[PDB]
């Protein structure tokens, strides 16, 4: 009944539409909020944050058998912490190069890497060693340690309504200790923030 | 959903002084 590391499947009810089946791998259970799971779903590149046993859109949650197994560490270790250019191919067959940063080796799914993008600051997961060999990934050349860890603090901001909403600092990056993951209560994406000295 | 571009308030008011959390996109 510990589901970290397990493949899972469940119904997902988007709005009032019919229940659809979802399949994914549970990467982690958030220490500062153990009802919060990070999930890598097949088909979504983005890591999801869900209270799997509390969220009302989730139904019939079951543990599945593990995925059929398969069989370079220096390349992966030099990639981590680094800024990168990641080349995606537009419908035109042309190339759009998103600048981003590689944050860590993903848990449970070791071939996979946590990555985030300047044009999209949420937490993605990709198998970057393939994209590097293919040439589609270039590694660019190269406060969070002064300040004590913010992990577990509950964040608070205002919307343009003046309505205040909350979130939670769930993780500090081991490779770049000024980078933090925030999961807001009203979204399932994991947003990446940098701790900056003011002015 | 639109994530705040900057965060500098905690509910217990303990956000460290002189710093801000900036969305990775700024």
UniProtKB/Swiss-Prot annotation, chain A:
Gene Ontology annotations of biological process type: gamete generation; meiotic cell cycle; positive regulation of DNA-templated transcription; positive regulation of Wnt signaling pathway; protein localization to chromatin; regulation of DNA-templated transcription; rRNA transcription; transposable element silencing by piRNA-mediated DNA methylation
Key words, A-Z: Acetylation, Cell cycle, Chromatin regulator, Developmental protein, Isopeptide bond, Meiosis, Nucleus, Phosphoprotein, Repeat, Ubl conjugation, Wnt signaling pathway
Region spans: Tudor-like domain 3: 150-199
Expression (tissue specificity): Highly expressed in ovarian cancer tissues.
Residue numbers of Phosphoserine PTMs: 59
Entry's localization field: Nucleus; Nucleus, Nucleolus
Region (Tudor-like domain 1): 3-66
Region (Histone H3K4me3 and H3R8me2a binding): 43-48, 89, 187-189
Identification of the protein by name: Spindlin-1
Biological source species: Homo sapiens (Human)
Upper classification of the organism: Eukaryota, Metazoa, Chordata, Craniata, Vertebrata
Parent-record interval covered: 51 to 262 of 262
Curated annotation (Swiss-Prot), chain B:
S-S pairs: none
Protein name from the UniProt record: Spindlin interactor and repressor of chromatin-binding protein
Induction cue: In response to DNA damage; expression is regulated by KLF4.
Organism field: Homo sapiens
Cellular location(s): Nucleus; Chromosome
Function per UniProt: Chromatin protein that stabilizes SPIN1 and enhances its association with histone H3 trimethylated at both 'Lys-4' and 'Lys-9' (H3K4me3K9me3). Positively regulates poly-ADP-ribosylation in response to DNA damage; acts by facilitating PARP1 ADP-ribosyltransferase activity.
Quaternary structure annotation from Swiss-Prot or TrEMBL: Interacts with SPIN1, SPIN2A, SPIN2B, SPIN3 and SPIN4. Interacts with TCF7L2 in a SPIN1-dependent manner. Interacts with PARP1; promoting PARP1 ADP-ribosyltransferase activity.
Designated gene of the protein: SPINDOC
